[PDB]
Design an enzyme around this catalytic site. Structure first.
Site, PDB file in Angstrom:
ATOM      1  N   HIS A  43       0.817  -1.219   0.000  1.00 21.33           N
ATOM      2  CA  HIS A  43       0.000   0.000   0.000  1.00 21.33           C
ATOM      3  C   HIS A  43       0.847   1.264   0.000  1.00 21.33           C
ATOM      4  CE1 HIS A  43       0.077   0.267   4.554  1.00 21.33           C
ATOM      5  NE2 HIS A  43      -0.037   1.560   4.275  1.00 21.33           N
ATOM      6  N   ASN A  67      17.679  11.509  12.049  1.00 23.04           N
ATOM      7  CA  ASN A  67      16.854  12.683  11.795  1.00 23.04           C
ATOM      8  C   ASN A  67      16.636  12.821  10.292  1.00 23.04           C
ATOM      9  OD1 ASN A  67      15.873  15.383  11.366  1.00 23.04           O
ATOM     10  ND2 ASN A  67      16.574  15.899  13.413  1.00 23.04           N
ATOM     11  N   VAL A  88      17.730  16.362   8.707  1.00 25.99           N
ATOM     12  CA  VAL A  88      19.082  16.873   8.849  1.00 25.99           C
ATOM     13  C   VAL A  88      20.072  15.852   8.303  1.00 25.99           C
ATOM     14  CG1 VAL A  88      20.881  17.571  10.546  1.00 25.99           C
ATOM     15  CG2 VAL A  88      18.450  18.115  10.977  1.00 25.99           C
ATOM     16  N   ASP A  97      -0.155  -7.536   1.840  1.00 19.02           N
ATOM     17  CA  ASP A  97       0.385  -6.172   1.822  1.00 19.02           C
ATOM     18  C   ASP A  97       1.912  -6.192   1.928  1.00 19.02           C
ATOM     19  OD1 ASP A  97       0.482  -3.417   1.796  1.00 19.02           O
ATOM     20  OD2 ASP A  97      -0.264  -3.112   3.800  1.00 19.02           O
ATOM     21  N   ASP A 111       1.294   1.769  20.043  1.00 15.43           N
ATOM     22  CA  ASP A 111       0.956   1.170  18.758  1.00 15.43           C
ATOM     23  C   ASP A 111       1.817   1.807  17.678  1.00 15.43           C
ATOM     24  OD1 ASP A 111      -2.250   1.114  16.899  1.00 15.43           O
ATOM     25  OD2 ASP A 111      -0.680  -0.381  17.005  1.00 15.43           O
ATOM     26  N   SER A 112       1.793   1.264  16.480  1.00 14.21           N
ATOM     27  CA  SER A 112       2.388   1.969  15.344  1.00 14.21           C
ATOM     28  C   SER A 112       1.260   2.853  14.801  1.00 14.21           C
ATOM     29  CB  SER A 112       2.953   1.003  14.291  1.00 14.21           C
ATOM     30  OG  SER A 112       1.984   0.037  13.924  1.00 14.21           O
ATOM     31  N   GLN A 154       0.038   5.967  11.328  1.00 16.29           N
ATOM     32  CA  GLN A 154       0.279   6.545   9.996  1.00 16.29           C
ATOM     33  C   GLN A 154       1.723   7.030   9.835  1.00 16.29           C
ATOM     34  OE1 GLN A 154       1.192   9.485   8.023  1.00 16.29           O
ATOM     35  NE2 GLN A 154      -0.722  10.550   7.688  1.00 16.29           N
ATOM     36  N   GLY A 155       2.353   6.639   8.738  1.00 13.71           N
ATOM     37  CA  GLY A 155       3.726   7.026   8.485  1.00 13.71           C
ATOM     38  C   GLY A 155       4.710   5.947   8.888  1.00 13.71           C
ATOM     39  N   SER A 195       3.895   2.834   8.258  1.00 14.92           N
ATOM     40  CA  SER A 195       3.586   1.763   7.303  1.00 14.92           C
ATOM     41  C   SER A 195       4.778   1.340   6.475  1.00 14.92           C
ATOM     42  CB  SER A 195       2.462   2.202   6.369  1.00 14.92           C
ATOM     43  OG  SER A 195       1.279   2.294   7.111  1.00 14.92           O
ATOM     44  N   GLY A 196       4.890   0.030   6.258  1.00 16.99           N
ATOM     45  CA  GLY A 196       5.982  -0.527   5.466  1.00 16.99           C
ATOM     46  C   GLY A 196       7.197  -0.898   6.302  1.00 16.99           C
TER      47      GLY A 196
HETATM   48  N1  LIG Z   1      -2.858   1.319  14.241  1.00 16.22           N
HETATM   49  C1  LIG Z   1      -1.816   0.976  13.510  1.00 16.22           C
HETATM   50  O1  LIG Z   1      -0.946   0.202  13.962  1.00 16.22           O
HETATM   51  C2  LIG Z   1      -1.661   1.558  12.144  1.00 16.22           C
HETATM   52  C3  LIG Z   1      -0.595   1.244  11.338  1.00 16.22           C
HETATM   53  C4  LIG Z   1      -0.480   1.793  10.073  1.00 16.22           C
HETATM   54  C5  LIG Z   1      -1.452   2.664   9.618  1.00 16.22           C
HETATM   55  N2  LIG Z   1      -2.489   2.949  10.416  1.00 16.22           N
HETATM   56  C6  LIG Z   1      -2.614   2.432  11.649  1.00 16.22           C
HETATM   57 CA   LIG Z   2      19.414  12.487   8.160  1.00 16.35          CA
END
Ligand SMILES: NC(=O)c1cccnc1
Ligand SMILES: [Ca+2]
Length: 223
Positions: free
Chosen positions: A40, A54, A57, A84, A171-172, A174-175, A177-178
């Site tokens: 995704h 970082n 930077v 996925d 939790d993990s 948005q961002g 992902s992957g």
């Molecule tokens: N809740 C989650 O772990 C999660 C992971 C990736 C995207 N959205 C939510």
């Molecule tokens: Ca860097």
């Protein structure tokens, strides 16, 4: 990552940032020329950024390498997020050291109970948004399939597992992902989806990597 901790510069040497003019997804280096990430996260024009802490930077250990080919799993379903997973080949091999290193693929599937490390530059809040510039980490256990399926009725396939805390707060997000879920020094999961972030009874859902090892190996061997 919600409720985690600052990893420390280059302590997660297999973590990569996928960049299309900005960070948009994580990934894992599985060898000097290949990265695994979520399907995704697919986009054309990806630059893989290795050796990052970082992301805003230049600190001195980065390697920026363009992707030459991307391969989304043949059975990826964007509506259910089943399968996925995607592979990205780098235009040139990365230089491997103590701070940029590959992560091993599993030879067995991990069990509920197993503690894993999840990492990323994703949102750190369950309500609102705050993106960190440095890498965040979270230690979380794999949950039983039954608790997973109870949390998300009708949504969990054999290619997914849940990890996290049913009480919430960690939790993990948005961002992230992957990105990688590493257990006992092996890549067992890919950050995939989840209902909001760190919500009670809604743990994170991860791509089960052990189901794809044969696909990954065959694909790398011929591309
Ligand atoms: N809740 C989650 O772990 C999660 C992971 C990736 C995207 N959205 C939510
Ligand atoms: Ca860097």
């Amino acid at each position: 990552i919600v409720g985690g901790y600052t990893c420390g510069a280059n302590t997660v040497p297999y973590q990569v940032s996928l960049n299309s003019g900005y960070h948009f997804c994580g990934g894992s280096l599985i060898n000097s020329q290949w990265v695994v990430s979520a399907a995704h996260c697919y986009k054309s024009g990806i630059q893989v950024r290795l050796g990052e802490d970082n992301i805003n930077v230049v600190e001195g250990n980065e390697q920026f390498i363009s992707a030459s080919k991307s391969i989304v799993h043949p059975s990826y379903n964007s509506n259910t997020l089943n399968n996925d997973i995607m592979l990205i080949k780098l235009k040139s091999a990365a230089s491997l050291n103590s701070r940029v290193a590959s992560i091993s693929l599993p030879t067995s599937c991990a069990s509920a109970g197993t503690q894993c490390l999840i990492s990323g530059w994703g949102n750190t809040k369950s309500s609102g948004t705050s993106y960190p510039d440095v890498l965040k980490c979270l230690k979380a256990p794999i949950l039983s399939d039954s608790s997973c399926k109870s949390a998300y009725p009708g949504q969990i396939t054999s290619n997914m597992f849940c990890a996290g805390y049913l009480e919430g707060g960690k939790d993990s997000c948005q961002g992230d992902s992957g990105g990688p879920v590493v257990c006992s020094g092996k890549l067992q999961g890919i950050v995939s989806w989840g209902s909001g972030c760190a919500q009670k009874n809604k743990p994170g859902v991860y791509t089960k990597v052990c189901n794809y090892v044969s696909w990954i190996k065959q694909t790398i061997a011929s591309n």
